[PDB]
Amino acid sequence: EGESSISIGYAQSRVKEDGYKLDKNPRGFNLKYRYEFNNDWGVIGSFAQTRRGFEESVDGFKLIDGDFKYYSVTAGPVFRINEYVSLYGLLGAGHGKAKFSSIFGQSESRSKTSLAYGAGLQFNPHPNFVIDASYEYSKLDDVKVGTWMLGAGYRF
């Protein structure tokens, strides 16, 4: 019913905000699944999960870890350019959540939604080993978020 491949890589995003961490770059892992409906045509799914890179500290028997989570999900078609060169597009949505730790009668938090758009490059040095590079960007009116992913894929 078609060839299937799996790809893994590290995800690095940049968020413009005044707070902890100078570069404000969330850390996480990106999982991509490739499914080919044809010899030169196929689709890919990229899932990115990132969290605040804050060192674990013990205070009040509770863990903060930055209280910030960022999730991204994108998908796009894959078209081969040459024998060992493939080009694919990335489209999807991103979701970020932030919580504040303090002592108050009531608790509050913030959640943001955004659209993700980008493109990716795929190189095939070996039949069972490919190099995947993906670029994803989220456009918000006040906040600009960029996500970069570098990894490798394995063909079954």
Q: Tokens at residue 61, please?
A: 């028997």
Distance from chain centroid for Cα 151 = 12
> What DSSP character marks residue 67?
S
Give the position of tokens 């608790």.
107
Task: Give the CA angle between residues 83, 84, 87 to the nearest 5°.
Answer: 100
Identity (one letter) of the amino acid at 65?
A: D
Q: Count the neighbouring beta carbons within 10 Å of the beta carbon of residue 100.
A: 11
CA gap 10, 127 in Å, rounded: 22
Element (H, E) at 132: strand 129-139
Method by which the model was determined: NMR
User: What are the structural domains of the chain?
Assistant: 1-156 (2.40.160.20)
Of the chain, the end-to-end C-alpha distance in Å amounts to 13
Residues 6+ apart with CB under 8 A from 119: 76, 87, 88, 89, 90, 134, 135
